[PDB]
Paper text:
Aminoacyl-tRNA synthetases have become the focus of drug discovery programs in several disease areas. − Compounds that target leucyl tRNA synthetase have already entered clinical development for TB treatment. This report focuses on lysyl tRNA synthetase (LysRS), the enzyme that charges lysyl tRNA with lysine. Aminoacyl-tRNA synthetases are an essential part of the protein biosynthesis machinery, responsible for charging tRNA with the appropriate cognate amino acid for incorporation into growing polypeptide chains. Molecules have been reported previously targeting LysRS in Plasmodium that block parasite growth. , LysS, the gene that encodes LysRS, is known to be essential for   − and has been classified in the top 200 most vulnerable genes to target for inhibition of growth. The crystal structures had confirmed that the compounds from this series were occupying the ATP pocket of LysRS.
Following the successful addition of a hydroxyl group at the two-position of the cyclohexyl ring, it was subsequently examined at the 3- and 4-positions with a methoxy at R2. At the 4-position, the hydroxyl retained potency against LysRS and gained KARS1 selectivity compared to 24. In KARS1, the equivalent residue is Asn497, which forms hydrogen bonds with the bound substrate lysine and Arg485, thereby blocking access to this part of the pocket. In LysRS, Thr425 is too distant from the bound substrate lysine and Lys413 (Arg485 in KARS1) to establish this hydrogen bond network, thereby allowing access of 27 and explaining the gain in selectivity. The crystal structure of 27 indicated that there was space to extend the hydroxy group deeper into the pocket. In a bid to develop this further, to explore the potential for interaction at the 4-position, a carbon spacer was added; again, this displayed good LysRS potency, but the slight decrease in MIC potency, for both 27 and 28, prevented further scope for optimization.
Residue numbers in the entry:
A (entry chain A), B (entry chain A): 12 to 50, 55 to 127, 130 to 149, 155 to 353, 366 to 446, 455 to 499
Write the structure that this text describes.
Amino acid sequence: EQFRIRRDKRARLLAQGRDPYPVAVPRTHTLAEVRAAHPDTATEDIVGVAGRVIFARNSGKLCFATLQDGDGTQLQVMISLDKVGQAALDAWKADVDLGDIVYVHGAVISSRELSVLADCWRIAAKSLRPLPMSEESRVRQRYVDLIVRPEARAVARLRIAVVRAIRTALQRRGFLEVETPVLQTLAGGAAARPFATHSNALDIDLYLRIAPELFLKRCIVGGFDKVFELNRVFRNEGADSTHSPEFSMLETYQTYGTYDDSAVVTRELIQEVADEAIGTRQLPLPDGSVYDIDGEWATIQMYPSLSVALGEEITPQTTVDRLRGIADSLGFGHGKLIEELWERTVGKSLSAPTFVKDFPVQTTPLTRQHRSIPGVTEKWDLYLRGIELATGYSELSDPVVQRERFADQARAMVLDEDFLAALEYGMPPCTGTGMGIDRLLMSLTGLSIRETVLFPI
Amino acid sequence: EQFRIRRDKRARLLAQGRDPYPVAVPRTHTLAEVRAAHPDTATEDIVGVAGRVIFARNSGKLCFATLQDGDGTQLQVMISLDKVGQAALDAWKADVDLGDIVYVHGAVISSRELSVLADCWRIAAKSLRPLPMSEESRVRQRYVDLIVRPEARAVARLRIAVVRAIRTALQRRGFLEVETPVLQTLAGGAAARPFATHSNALDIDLYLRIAPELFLKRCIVGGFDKVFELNRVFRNEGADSTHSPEFSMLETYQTYGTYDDSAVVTRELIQEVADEAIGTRQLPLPDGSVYDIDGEWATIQMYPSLSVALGEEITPQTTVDRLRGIADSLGFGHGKLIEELWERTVGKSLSAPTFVKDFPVQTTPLTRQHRSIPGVTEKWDLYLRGIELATGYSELSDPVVQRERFADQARAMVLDEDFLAALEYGMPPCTGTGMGIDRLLMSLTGLSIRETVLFPI
Ligand SMILES: COc1nc(N)nc2c1C(=O)N([C@H]1CC[C@@H](O)CC1)C2
Ligand SMILES: COc1nc(N)nc2c1C(=O)N([C@H]1CC[C@@H](O)CC1)C2
Ligand SMILES: N[C@@H](CCCC[NH3+])C(=O)O
Ligand SMILES: N[C@@H](CCCC[NH3+])C(=O)O
């Protein structure tokens, strides 16, 4: 209803020569800065402050109101009669609503609560909607969420702190951030249905990237020692609590190191992120518990660990007829089956931060064959607080193998021949990694994927 | 031809038990690091180095070869007979081609040129393609370009240095980088044909963002004091030397400042970028000239400056029948005409860094009406070295005006009602800006748009 009462006070401010949306009011300080510089008498420090009025208490010849700056800091104001204007007091009473941004120049004082008492005051913006929420309305209107709910404020700022931490971490180690195409003639470097968009300029279809690996790899051919890219990827698939079709994603590549190297870094990275952004490696969680991610983290092998949990020897050689069987007696091909069985037994048991290494050849086209063990590739996954957080490879640089690997993939015939060309100019040995920002945050906080981004749907 | 000779030496290395693409060779130092620590005698510093062999000179019982690290630094190697192996020398002669990555452990020495003389040596990767180029092949194969052409190396690293400079600059001033949706239900915050992609998850079409403004604005409602976002946008339109359909783009928003504020920053920003990434504000250019971007930069008004150059008074009031006329006598509506005429007269004259401010209402739906002058909006553009580099607004926060502005835009009817909702919760006065990374680099270097990105097409 009050929609209309608000719109009325707007135009009755316009016509009256009052500006309800001024170009520029002279704020001298953020409320934070007033607080930070003032730990029942009066002081002669004068400031201009601005602030949302998120609490009124109009009372005759004095109105007391609370101002909340964007970040949520608060300073009370006391709009008075004798300090300037009787039209002042009336206009204040008349024209101020709740969720109204308000500039207030004057002196800052101790009260019976730190307030500021006005010489000047002026409306900086007029709300045409009061402040009130289901969680699928918080996401629809993050801009109100951010006003009403502190935790929204804190989470948004966390994601940001975390992303900066990552950049600090990588940069300190000599990593260089790069930009690779989002629109590509064919999308690759991962396994998912791409998004297709039609180009006017070319009259061909183009695909949004599912991942930067293939282009990041061209860079390593190029002479990049150490590279990464933090940026959205697009997977044209369903959404669940760990999956969304557009999400932010880290990738990383270092020359002259293997998956054993890239797992040391990933741990240090993650822990360094905890330190900067959170201040503890003893992570408090919604239920009140604490997940420790400090010290050293356990590595297991996929086949061995799967073997122990099944009570029988599973290997690269174990046939699919055998695996299908074991699979049934709990409830396509080999690689899928190994990972499936592993995840469904060992995977779901895990608590503490855990790496799992030495993976089925079938389901790892891009990662080098293992240096000693036949049948497996030098890939790891990291399961942190029971979430598939991150992946690392010793990267396959043999073009003929890589060609072979791809052709078989297609057989259930257009291959990325430029990718393959690049490799046959010579890619030095490198370990890549991959990590998801939403899950990084989930794994650290227990927040849902839908709370870790500013604007989902 | 040598394609096949190469592929042969690969499999004849495999079968022979030699690994042509090893998982991990123990590099102890980058060539840079060897150089940096060694300004015709011998020294007992031992290292393992890796490097592309970009020059052979095989000669009996000594081969001299040059190794080029990814960044382009060079150390010569001297594969010998007596220092280890006679099969060594032969295998070296036999199996080494050009564009081959090669690990060489041994002692570092002064020669008659700083080389390294080997105990061990081993092929790190085998090329199946020699090193050779038109400019529309350099772009098709940036990974070779980066190997062969220094300037490619330098440019790639420049773009990177520049992007870091921006982040430093903004962060120092207290800006917070944010991530807003690339996929949106309707795309806005600029004027261009969007890219449409179909979603499986929802069975609706979605549009890649043409710009982040509208979502960045929701953030300011949200309580963000100071925000920005450096990231690709997508405009489904033609390519020219200043326009590409996917490009990287900065946007910026500060509360409690106007377009006069955001132009001070933009200048300081740009100049600070020059200092960090280039080391001079006296910019050397291809023709050998120098563009000075130091000191203070000139502001002009659009109508006034257009008036002087036409020799007659043009204003908001000047009719379209008049403008069409002037337009003819050189060779839709008012706003378009003003900007058109301005660009075609004053625009093309400009040399020195120049701001142009106070713009036609029609062609600036999102920027506030000017605080005193009727008919114009408080928007500026920055023309640097004759290129439309950047834009700044005092941002329109009046929702009813903003609603009005939009409806008229549609009339040549679906409006972004959530955008409009956000504004009617109250957006404090803020100045936004917008800047293009490719043009930033063009404007600084004289490089084409197609050289400023890693991977175009
Ligand atoms: C929301 O996160 C994701 N959404 C989709 N739709 N797909 C993936 C993620 C995610 O975090 N992924 C990573 C998992 C660890 C590594 O394999 C890197 C990718 C895949
Ligand atoms: C390659 O750069 C661009 N490509 C397209 N297709 N459109 C634009 C640019 C660019 O740099 N733009 C900016 C110009 C200054 C400001 O108005 C911000 C946008 C628009
Ligand atoms: N492309 C991988 C991430 C990088 C892995 C290392 N090569 C993925 O989408 O999971
Ligand atoms: N959306 C603008 C850039 C930001 C201008 C300030 N609001 C553009 O695409 O040019």
